[PDB]
């Protein structure tokens, strides 16, 4: 960090926050998953009343 700053990455918490997550939640979130920009999210939703949206249905197997 430059300036001393938490242990989270500004960078990275921006980014998520312009997907409306409280800085709170991204601050803490990137701090906990080693300023993980990826993880980040992925504790914010897991979290967060939300369903996955992972495109199209492409499956393994036609069944």
């Known amino acids: 960090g430059s300036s001393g700053s938490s242990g989270v990455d500004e960078k990275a918490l921006k980014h998520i926050t312009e997907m409306g997550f409280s800085k709170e939640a991204s601050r803490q979130a990137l701090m906990d ?5 990826e993880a980040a999210l992925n504790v914010l939703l897991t979290s967060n009343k939300q369903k996955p949206v992972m495109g199209p249905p492409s499956g393994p197997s036609s069944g």
């Not at 998953?33 to 920009?37: D, E, Q, T, Y």
Request: hydrophobic share 20%; charged share 0%.
């Open 33 to 37: 998953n080693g300023n993980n920009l």
